Amino acid sequence: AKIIGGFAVSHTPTIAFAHDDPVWAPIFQGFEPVKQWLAEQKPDVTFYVYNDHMTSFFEHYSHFALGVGEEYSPADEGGGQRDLPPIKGDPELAKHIAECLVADEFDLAYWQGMGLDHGAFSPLSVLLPHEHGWPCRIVPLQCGVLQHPIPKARRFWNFGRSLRRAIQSYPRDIKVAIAGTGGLSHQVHGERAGFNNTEWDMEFMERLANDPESLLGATVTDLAKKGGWEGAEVVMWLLMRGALSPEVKTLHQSYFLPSMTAIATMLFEDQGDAAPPAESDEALRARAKRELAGVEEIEGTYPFTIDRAVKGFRINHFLHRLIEPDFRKRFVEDPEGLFAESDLTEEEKSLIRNRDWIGMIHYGVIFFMLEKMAAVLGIGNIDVYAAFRGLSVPEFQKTRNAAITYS
Amino acid sequence: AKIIGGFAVSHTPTIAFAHDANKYDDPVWAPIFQGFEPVKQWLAEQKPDVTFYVYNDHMTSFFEHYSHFALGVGEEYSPADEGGGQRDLPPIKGDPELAKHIAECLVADEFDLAYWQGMGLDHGAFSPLSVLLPHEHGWPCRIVPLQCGVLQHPIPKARRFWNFGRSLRRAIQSYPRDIKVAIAGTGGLSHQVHGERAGFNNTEWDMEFMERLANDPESLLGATVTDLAKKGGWEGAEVVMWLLMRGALSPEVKTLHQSYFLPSMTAIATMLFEDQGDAAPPAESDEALRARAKRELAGVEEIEGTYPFTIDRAVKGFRINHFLHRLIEPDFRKRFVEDPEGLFAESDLTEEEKSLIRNRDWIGMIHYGVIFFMLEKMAAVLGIGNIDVYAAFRGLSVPEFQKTR
Ligand SMILES: O=C(O)c1cc(O)c(O)c(O)c1
Ligand SMILES: [Fe+3]
Ligand SMILES: [Fe+3]
C-alpha cells in the first residue's frame, strides 16, 4: 500500500564477473548500509530499475519494458549462466502499475520469461542473500537507453512521479522498495573509453536528493561529456528518485572508483508526499479501471489482460514456437516427445492433446496461437470458430453470408 | 515532407488467402477486390515515396516482449512465418532516415516508443499490402512500419492514439527532405474471433465509426475499450489504429472512397482520405519543432572518441550486432571457437564485417557500428577479459592502459 525507501546503485559486472581484496573491502562499506536496510525493513517487492545491455533486449528494443512475469532466471551473456536462483516477480502489482501508467498517458511494453543481465543480477546478488531462493519479489523496469532517441529526463522523472501515485494506490497491504540501478559516470566504448569526472559525480549525487527538480533540463549531451557516454544511463536514477517522496534522508552516500567504472551508492528514506495530491486514491483506482470497466458484462469474451497473459504464458509460449518449421515438424510428428520435454502442466498438455479450442480460450491461450496450431494441423480458422460456438462447421457457416475456408 | 493522404483497410488473413489462391475471379471474392481497386489506383497515381504503415502483429513477432508503439527502423522487411511458412512476397524496403526523424519528434512530444529490425511482418501488414500494391518483384514504395500492441491490455487510451497521430503529422511534415508520404491504418472493422461471442458483427456501428472517423473524429476520443468491444467485437477494438492514422491527417479530409463487405467474420472495409492540408497554418512552425528534436543530441558532435548509438548506427551495424548477439546461444558460441570459418560462411555477414571479427579488431568495430556490449560478450567467449578491449580502444597495451588511479 506504500513505499518505504529506495536505493540507487552502480551495476557494473565487476561486482559479478570477479567477486562471486582490500581495494574492494572498504567499498562493500558502501554496500553495508543497503544490505542492512533490506533485512530490517523486510521488503515485499523491489521495483527494480535497470538496463539490459543488449542481452535480452536487442532486435526489439523499447523504452519502458515492464517485467510482469511469475519469475526470472539469469541471462546467459556468452560468459555463461551466472550461478544464481530464479527470483520471483509480482504480476499482481505489475498489472496495477501498468493500468495507472497507461491512464496517465505513458507508453509501455510487457515481457516475461527473458533472463536478466548484469544490469540486474550483478549488483542485486551483492545486495540480497541468494541461498536456495530469494528474500523477496521483484518488479523489473527495463530501460532502453542505448538506442537514441531515449525518453527525456523530464520524462523519466514523471514516470517515477506517476509510479509514486500508482504504487500508493495499490489497495493491498505491502511495503515496497525501489531499486534505480544506474551509473555512475563512465564510458566503455571507443577512443575516449576511460573518461570519468568525480566532481560531476559528486555534484550529481548531491543534486539528486537536495534539488532534483532542477536536473530536469539535462540533455543527453549534458551527461555525455560530463560523465561519459554510457555514464548517462543515470536517467534511471531520476525516475527512482521521482517515485520516492520529495524530501529524503540519505541513509548512506558512498563512492570509490576502482577499475573502469565509477562505483557509488545512494540509499534514501521515503517520508511522505509534500502535500495531499491533486487526485485521490479512490479517484485513481477507479480511473485505472475505466477503459475495461464493465467489460465483464460482455459475454463469451475473455479479455487478454496481464493476469491472463501470465496464466497463459507457458502454453502461449509453447504454441508460439509453431512458427518455427522444426518445432512444428516435431509438433505434428512427435507431440508426446515434444511435451515430455516442455515445461507445461498436465492440463496444458491435455488442452493441446485433446484439441480443445474453447478450453484454451477459457484457460488463457490468446486466439492467435490457436490460429497457428490450426494451420499447422492443416485445418482452418472456421473449424476453430465453430468449435467456439459448439457448432458443426456447416452450421456455423449458416451464420456467415458467404461460406469461405482459409488458414 | 508532403503528406498526400491516408487510407484505412481491414487486415484479415482472408484477404491474403484470396490473393494467394487467385480468387480474384471468384463471385464471392470478386466484389471484395473491386473494393480495393480505388485505393490501389490512387496509390499508383499519387506514387508516395513512403507509406507510414500502422498495424498490429498477431502474436507472431511480438509475444514475449510486447510494446505499445513499436516503430520499425530497419533496412527492409520480410513475411513472417505464421505456422505454415513465409508467404511468397519479396521484402519491402523500410525508411531508416525517416524513421529516425519521426522518432526524434515523437520523443520530444513525450511519447515512449520501441525500435526494431529484422523480424517478419505478419498478416497485419502483408495481408492488405499484397492486394493494394504490385509486388511482382519489388514494392513500389518504402514503409515505416508502426506496430501497435492492441492485444494485451492495458493498451493506450483511444485519445493517445489520436495524439500520437497529431504528433506524427507534424513529425512527418517537419521532415526536411521532399518526399510524398501516404499513411495507413489497418484492422477491423467489426469482428470477434474468440470465445463464445465469436462471429459477432455490427454493420450499423461499422458505418457509424467510419463516418465519424471521416467527419468528426474528435467525437470518438472518449470511447473506451469496453465501448468499442461491445460495439465492434473485442478484436474489432483494434480500430484505435484508424484513429492514429486519422489523427495524422488534415483536420478535415476528403473521403474519395469507401467499401464494405462482410463475407465471413470480419467487416472488410476500405477508406481513402485525400489530405486537405495546412488550410489552417501550423500551430508550431517547422523550424521550431525541428529544433525541439535534434535538441537532446545538440552539440554532442564535439566529443572525441565517442561514437553514439543512434538509429542510423543500429541500422548500419544490425547484421554484425545480431551476429555477435547470438553468442549467448551456447550451440553457436561453442561453434565460434571450434569452427569460426564455417559459421561466417553460414551467416549473411559481409566480407568487411567478417574480417573485423577475425582480426579481433576492437576499435574498427566500434567505428563500423557495433555497440560495446556485443564485444563484451564476444570477449568473454574466447576467454579474454573485459579490460583488454578498453586497452585496445586507447591503442595501448594490456598493462600500459591499467595506469590512471
Ligand atoms: O478470422 C478472421 O477473419 C481474422 C483473423 C485474424 O487473425 C485477424 O487479425 C483478423 O483481423 C481477422
Ligand atoms: Fe549499464
Ligand atoms: Fe489486427
Numbering used by the authors:
A (entry chain A): 2 to 21, 27 to 413
B (entry chain B): 2 to 406
Quote the paper.
The three catecholic compounds are degraded by three evolutionarily related type II extradiol dioxygenases–DesB, LigAB, and DesZ–in S. sp. SYK-6. On the other hand, DesB exhibits not only a strict substrate specificity but also high enzyme activity for gallate. In this study, we analyzed the mechanism of the substrate recognition of DesB on the basis of the crystal structures of reaction intermediates.
Interestingly, a large shift of the Fe (II) ion was observed in the DesB-gallate complex. On the other hand, the Fe (II) ion at the A-site is located at a distance of approximately 2 Å from the R-site and coordinates OH and OH of gallate. The crystallographic analysis in this study showed alternative conformations of the Fe (II) ion, R- and A-sites, both in C2221 and P21 crystals. Interestingly, no crystal structures showed 100% occupancy of the Fe (II) ion at the A-site. The observation of the alternative conformation of the Fe (II) ion could be explained by a hypothesis that the shift of the Fe (II) ion is reversible under anaerobic conditions. Analysis of the van der Waals surface around the active site showed that direct coordination between the hydroxyl groups of gallate and the Fe (II) ion at the R-site cannot be allowed due to steric hindrance. We therefore concluded that the shift of the Fe (II) ion from the R- to A-sites is required for direct coordination between the Fe (II) ion and the substrate. In addition, the catalytic reaction of DesB requires the shift of the Fe (II) ion, leading to the bidentate coordination of the substrate to the Fe (II) ion.
